Every structure is written in C-alpha cells, then in structure tokens.
Amino acid sequence: MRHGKKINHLSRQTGHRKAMLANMACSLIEHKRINTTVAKAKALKQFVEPLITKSKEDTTHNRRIVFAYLRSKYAVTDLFRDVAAKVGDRPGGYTRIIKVGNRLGDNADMAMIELVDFNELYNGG
Amino acid sequence: RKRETADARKEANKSIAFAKLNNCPTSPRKMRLVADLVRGQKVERALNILRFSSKEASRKLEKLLLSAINNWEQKNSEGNLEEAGLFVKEIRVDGGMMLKRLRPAPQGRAHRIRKRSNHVTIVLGAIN
Amino acid sequence: SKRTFQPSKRKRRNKHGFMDRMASANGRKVLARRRAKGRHKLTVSSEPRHK
Amino acid sequence: AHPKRKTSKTRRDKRRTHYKATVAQIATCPITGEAHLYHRAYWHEGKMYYRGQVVIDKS
Amino acid sequence: PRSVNSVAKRARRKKIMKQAKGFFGRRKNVWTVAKNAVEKAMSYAYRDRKQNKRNFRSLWIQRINAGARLEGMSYSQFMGKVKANGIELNRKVLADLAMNHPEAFKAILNKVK
RNA sequence: UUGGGCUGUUCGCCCAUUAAAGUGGUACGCGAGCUGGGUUCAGAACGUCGUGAGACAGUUCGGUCUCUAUCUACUGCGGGCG
RNA sequence: AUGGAUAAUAAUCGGGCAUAAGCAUAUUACCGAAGCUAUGGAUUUGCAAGUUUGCAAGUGGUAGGGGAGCAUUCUAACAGGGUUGAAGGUUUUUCGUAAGGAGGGCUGGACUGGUUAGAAAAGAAAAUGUAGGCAUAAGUAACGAUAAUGCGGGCGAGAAACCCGCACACCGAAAAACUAAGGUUUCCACAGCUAUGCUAAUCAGCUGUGGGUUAGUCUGGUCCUAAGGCGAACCCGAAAGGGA
RNA sequence: GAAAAGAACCGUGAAUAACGGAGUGAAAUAGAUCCUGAAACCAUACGCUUACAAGCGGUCGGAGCCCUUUCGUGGGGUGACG
C-alpha cells in the first residue's frame, strides 16, 4: 500500500537517487536538452522546477540554497547567469517532456526533456 | 519419370514472388509471435507493424519483406507496384539446426543448452 | 579449499619421468606395454619443456 | 514438485492462446506522411516532428 | 549369413497403424500407443456384435408396443394373440409395418384380435 | 470452551481465574506447512550380562529433516462467446 | 406391524417414487444370455468312395505337449524382369484362416527376383536394457556477492555495456606494486563479429594476419654439501633382486 | 556429380548473412549439413465439427454437411445425438 507516496525511488538508494538527480540537473543546465528515460525525466522535472523558480532572484542566500542541491559551481553560475535571464517572468513549467520512442538494449521508453525558453521552433499548438 | 521433364514442369516459380531467410540465429517460437501480426496484412501495414514492433525478431524480418517486394518487382517488370496492392499471402516460420552446449550445474553435473535457429518463408501475392 | 593436484614440474619428473621408469625392473615393463599398445605419448617426460 | 504426466500438444496449445503479441498503436502525420507511434515524436529527415511542428532541426 | 528384417519390420507395423486413423492425440502416429489402441478397438469390435443383435430387438419391441397401444392393446397381449394364431412374422417386419404401413399393421391387429 | 510451574511428553499433579475450562474422529488430522525436544545412525561414560568381540523397552552429553507445483482441490483477478 | 441410543466429509429401496409399484397364495401372456434352434461358411478325429465328397462326435483355455505354414539373408539348378525405369520411400485396389501375396499413381535413378531343394547372425512392446535424434515441464528457474551509476561528443547500418570528457561511487596491511609455484604466448598493433563471452556489441584473455623476451655483476650450470638416491669391491637371496 | 563444369554477372540488403534471377548439368527439391532420404518432433493452407457440458477417448447405431462416381441397398472425410 502506497496511498499517497508521491515520490519515485527509481530503484536506487536514498543517496544514489539524490546523486543522480543532482547529476542530471547539471547536464540539463549546461545543455538545454537531454535524452533520458520517461520515469527519470518525470522525476528530474519535479526536482528541477523549484530550483529554476528560486533562480529568479539572485541573492547570496538563494545561491547557496541552489548550490546545496546542484553541488557544482559550474551549474550554479550557468543557472544564475543566463537561464534566469532567458526564463523571464514565466508563471511556471519551465521544462517540457517529449517521448521519442524506445531504446534497443532493454526496450525502455525514452524522452527528450528540454527547457521551454531555449526552444524557438516548437510551440505545441 | 523423366527428371528433366518433372523439373521443367515444377519450375513454375516464374510467376510467384517469394523470399526466404535461412539460418537465422533466433528461436522459432519467438518469431512465430511476430509472424501472426503480419500474416494476411497489406504490404505496407505489415512494414509499419514490423518497424514499430517491440521485438528484436522484427529488425531482420522487416527487410525480408522488402526483399520479397523487390523480387516481385523483378518478376513483374512491366507494371508499377502501388496499383497491384500487394499483401502477405503466406508466411511460415520453421525450425533449424540447433547447436548444443554445456552448462556446469551445481554438484559436478552438466546441463544441456540448445541454441536454436529458424527458417522463414514469405510469399506476397497480388490483389489486382 | 585445497585440491588434490598441486602441480610441480620437478616432483612430477622425479616420480613419473623416463629415468624413473627406466631405473626399476618392473617400471621398465610399463614402457614395453605402452609401446606395444601404440601410445603416441609415453611417460610424462614426453611433454615439451619451456623454450 | 514434478509433473506426473507429459503435457499433451493439445493442453499446451490451448494454453498458448494468450501468449500472442500486441500490435503497436501506429499513427500517421498529415504533414510529412511518415508513420510513427501515437503520442511519440519521430525523425523524418534530420528533424523531429511531433504535432505538425518541428522540435529539433539537425539538418 | 546375416539376415535383417528391416523393410518388413516396418511394413508390418504400417498396416496395423493405418487402421488407427482418426484417433485422438498420439494414438494415431506413435507405434506403441497405436498398437495398444488397435488391439483394444478390435476387442471392442468382437463384442458389440452380439449386442447389435439384442439392441435392435429392443427397438423393434418398443415400436411394436407403440403401434399396438394405439388400438387399445399391449405388446404382451398382442404378441400372445399373434403367436397363438399361426402368423410367424418376426419383430423386424412387424416394426417396419407398424412404422411405415399403419394400415397393414391395424389389419394384422384386427385379424388376430 | 483461560493463562502459567514441573516433565520431550500424551497423560497427570499443582497455582490463579472463568458461565464453562467437554468427550472424541479426520493415516492416534495436518513434516512437497514448520521445530527435532523424545525415539532406531555412526563418538563417549555409568549399572548389569557375557572369558571375549558385544548387548540392554536401563540411564546421561553431543549429533545434515532434500524438491523451481504438471493435473485436480482452494483463495482472488481477467479475456472469448452466449 | 410397534418400542427397545447412536459416530464422526452429504445422504440413500441403486434413483424417481409407490398406500400399491409392499407382503402371502394361485393363474395367464410377455421380456430376458455368446444356452437351444433356423441360414451361410470354416476346421479336428473316426468311418466309406476316390485321388475332394458323404455321415457321426466335437471345436473356452494359463503352465505345458503336438501338427501344418509366412516373412527375412544367402546358396545350387531351370526359367526371367529392368534407364521404354531395379531396389528403397508415400498413397490406393484386390486376394488368403492368419503370418502375408499381387497390381496402379507419385518420388527414386541401378539392380532384382519366380519354381524345387538347402543353411541360418531367421521376426521385439516392455529387461529402473544400449547408441543417436527429438518433445514435455516452458519461454518457466536462472543470467553467478545489494560497490552505482548519469549525461554530452567519436567511429559506426546498428551503442544502457566500446573510445574520449565532465560528474558520482568503491578498495586502499586492500580490490595497490614486485615476484616465487604454476600456466607456456594469454603480451603489442591492425582487420572480424561466424563460433566463444550465461544479453547485444563497432569490444575482448575469441578468430586471422604482422611483431615482441638482448646480462661479466639478477636466478640456476660450469663451485660445495644436508635428508635421500645410485653404488665398482664385499655380504646375502629360487630368479627378478636386497644391503652397503 | 560421369567429369567441379563447385554458381562469372545483376537486384534487395550495411554486409563476400540470406535470398531471388542468370549461366553448368540429365537433374541445384544433386549447392558443398550436397545419392535416396522414412519415424518421432515443429509449423501453414483447405473441408467438417466444437463455448450447459464430466471419466482408458474406443466400439456398435445415427442425422446433417463436403469430394468422387461403372451411377450405386457404391467409395472417401467430418461427424450433432444414443
């Protein structure tokens, strides 16, 4: 019974899961679009939305708070320099997820998790 | 009977267009699963099904159908291909010569492992 | 655990070598039996040495 | 436990009736005509079309 | 000299297996299962031949009884009055008449009654 | 239609309660459900018998409980057809 | 006819059910077996005609006893068949009490076989029989320490596992370095993904081609000896041989 | 295979994996797993039946429906039901 457990362990320990979620965010920040599985992308979305939300105000406290999550100054500076300037005043949902088929080794459903404000060719409708 | 006469009479394959895939290192029970989805379908619906099937037994079955289409185009040179409306008349997945290897089980005994093969045959036929 | 065969290419030759078979009177009959049967490999001394 | 009787080719054939495969949900886009999986993107020619638009232009 | 009965060894069992045609499962192709089923089939066929002669007489008697009870009679009384009248018609012909020729059956009944 | 002390115990005696602490069957129900405490494996010792090797309905310490559920029988959930 | 207690999975005239369809006596008709009879056929003894017929009595059968035969392989004589299609394999028709015989269609492409007589490696359904092949359990157990992976580029038809880079994690009196025993080319480079790798692989301790080991001072011999071995001479023992 | 005459060449395919053609032959369903090549075993097409019905799966009766026919109280296949 998991009547309310709104968190995906991703078949990993409590430390490995957070390490992977912090390692994927740096990649999604330095390259504005990465290719993952569907569940990992859906978890990365919920992990990275509040960070980009906090990044909309450059304070010495918010910088350290985001650093405590990202654990890399190279991603902290690249999130606070241009990602925050290009997001602007969006209400929410700074990322999009698009399925691109299945893999070959284990037949896993793939996804193309991307930033909304960095893709100028796709709108949705 | 005269064997040359029997062979000249049986050489009626100048009309039927078919394709064969012999000595494929895959089991027949796993390709008979994807053959049932293709049997009887149109020549393009079958291609789409084989291209988007979530089975490793379709990557080499989707090009056997293309080879069959090319053989049909070779045999019926006078005429296009989309007006005929090809389909998959018959498709059979048979067995093949299997290799035998040994796996050491616990307590000093050996079990047998048979790497199986399979033969695939496909004929197209036309609606016209 | 420790098995029964712990190889040694001198304890092998001191016990099954050609000069150990040829030294005894009844050990010299093993050579005759093997030559009569037609064994391509005689006593373990037939194994090639390291070169 | 161990089977007491060899499974007949009828009892083992009536059991392999739900062992069939499942044909995927294939759709077609009325932009480039290429077929794809429903609710999935696809690469046509150096590009990625999803819903009539272009997501990636790698040409 | 060395004598091997290889051809006739299988030609003998082909003939015994060709009459196990239509049997369920491996009783039609497997030799040691077909031979055990053909012999039992022949054992069943030897009998049921004595029973075909007494299962048809029951049907004839039932049909004669049905045809005789339409005229307010019974099979026992009808057969008694027929046998003690010098008629000598077997139950096969009597049932054929009761089924196909009710006029002839009722004529026989009125003559023996 | 109870919980404990003693015993491997069934049984039995005792302690404190309860309306009551029933008699039996189901391979003395149930080990492809569990434990191996007792009993009949190999070690050792005591009493007794046998000259001896050895034995005891005599006692004591220690001592490997194998198997991926085919059919039927159950507990649940689905597809097809009518 | 009535009362005289009953056993543990749901029960009983076999069941429906019957106030007669229960019980007692008497009568008639009918049903009822491979019993008897009617028809057809086969066979064993005994009696006659002959060279098969007629009559009489029979004809369940284990251990066991007797008599007539079939197929298979080969041989001796006479007489044959076959590339205008032999043996063999697959279907079909017909004949005989049966073992079996003969004919036709299809595959097959070189041997085969009638009559009489003879010989035997002369017939499988079972021996927890032997060898080979193939099923079932079943697409089930399992894929071999719960130290861990994520992303971006490269070759490529094809990348969760290959190469590069940035991150994460593990060992660190070790999962680090040398090397003995042992293995005896597994070492290095390039081509390959057939078999091998418990998955795929563009990768490899795998496959095929070209290379790789340099000593006056290191380890052994040319130097020495222990335990032990051999051992002229010598002492014993049928022989081989033992002691030294 | 009598003799390599052992498949030049073209197409699909990434592919000298496989196949379809084209040439050799009397034969390629004689293609190197190569003479004929059966049985177990694994599949496809066609004809008849099968989702209210309990057991050595057969035997004796018996409609209906498909092929053949010397035309039939002829043959073959499946067979509801007893």
B53 closest CB neighbour out of D24, D35, D36? D24
- Distance CA(A37)–CA(B29), nearest Å, equals 30
| Cβ pair A34, A27 in contact under 8 A | yes
Nearest-5° angle of CA B27, CA B33, CA B39? Answer: 120
| Beta-bridge mates of residue A33 | A114
- Residue A66 to residue A51: CA distance in whole angstroms: 6
Across the D/E interface, how many CB contacts are shorter than 8 Å?
4
Q: Which residues, 6 or more positions from A52, have their beta carbon under 8 angstroms from its beta carbon?
A: A79, A83, A84, A87, A94, A95
Contacts of D56 in chain A (CB under 8 A): 33, 121
Backbone φ/ψ region at B27: left (φ over 0), alpha (ψ -120 to 50), beta: beta
**At D14, is the secondary structure helix, strand, or coil?**
coil
* Best CA proximity match to D37, nearest among D28, D26, D52: D26
- Pairing assessment for the beta strands A95-96 and A114-115 based on DSSP bridges: antiparallel
- Radius of gyration, CA atoms only, chain D: 22
How many B/D residue pairs have CB atoms within 8 Å? 24
CB atoms within 10 A of CB B27: 18
- Per the CB < 8 Å rule, is A122 touching D50? yes
| Helices (runs of H) and strands (runs of E) counted in chain C | 3, 0
Say if CB E66 and CB E98 are below 8 A apart: yes
Contacts of A125 in chain D (CB under 8 A): 51
Number of residues written out for chain E: 113
Question: Tell me, in Å, how far CA of E86 is from C1' of H36?
Answer: 75
**Interface membership of D9 toward E (CB under 8 Å):** yes
- Identify the bridge partners of residue B109 per DSSP, sorted by sequence position: B105
Resolution (A): 2.8
CA distance E59 to E43: 25
Tell me if B111 sits within 8 A of B102, measured CB to CB: yes
As beta bridge partners, residue B5 has: none
Cβ-7 Å neighbors of strand F: D 1-5, 7, 11, 18
Q: Under a CB-based contact definition with an 8 Å cutoff, are residues A83 and A29 in contact?
A: yes
Task: List strands edge to edge, sheet with D42-43.
Answer: D42-43, D47-49, D54-57
Lookup: tokens for D3: 């089977």
Give, in order, the Cα–Cα distances in Å from A76 to each of A20, A22, A39, B107, E8: 17, 12, 25, 58, 91
- Specify the DSSP element, H or E, that contains A29: helix A14-30
Tokens coding D38: 């429903």
- Encoding tokens for residue E50? 């004595």
SS3 D23: coil
E101 touches strand G (CB under 7 A): no
Q: What is the 3-state secondary structure (H, E, C) of B46-96?
A: HHHHHHCCCCCCCCCCHHHHHHHHHHHHHHCCCCCCCCCCEECCEEEEEEC
User: Which position has the token pair 């997820």?
Assistant: A97
* Cα distances (Å, whole numbers) of residue E76 to A97, B99, E58, E73: 94, 79, 14, 9
Determine whether C1 is exposed, middle or buried from the number of CB atoms within 10 Å of its CB (0-12, 13-18, 19+). exposed
Name every residue whose Cβ is closer than 8 Å to that of residue D44 and which is 6 or more positions away in sequence: D32, D34
User: C19 — phi, psi (to 5°)?
Assistant: -70, -15
Q: Which residues pair with B18 in a beta bridge?
A: B123
Neighbour subunits, D (≥3 Cβ pairs < 8 A): A, B, E
Instruction: Report DSSP letters for A57-110, one per residue.
Output: S--HHHHHHHHHHH--HHHHHHIIIIIHHHH-S--S--EE--EEEE-SSS--EE
CB of D19 nearer than 7 A to strand G: yes
- Which is it for strands A114-115 and A36-37: parallel, antiparallel or unpaired? unpaired
CA B32 to chain centre: 10
Q: Do A35 and A110 form a contact (C-beta atoms < 8 A)? A: yes
Q: How many CB atoms lie within 10 A of CB B55?
A: 15
E39-42 contacts: CB < 8 A, separation 24 or more? Answer: none
* B63 Cα distance to chain centroid: 10
Half-sphere CA count of D9, side-chain side, radius 13 A: 4
Q: Is E94 helix (H, G, I), strand (E, B) or coil?
A: helix
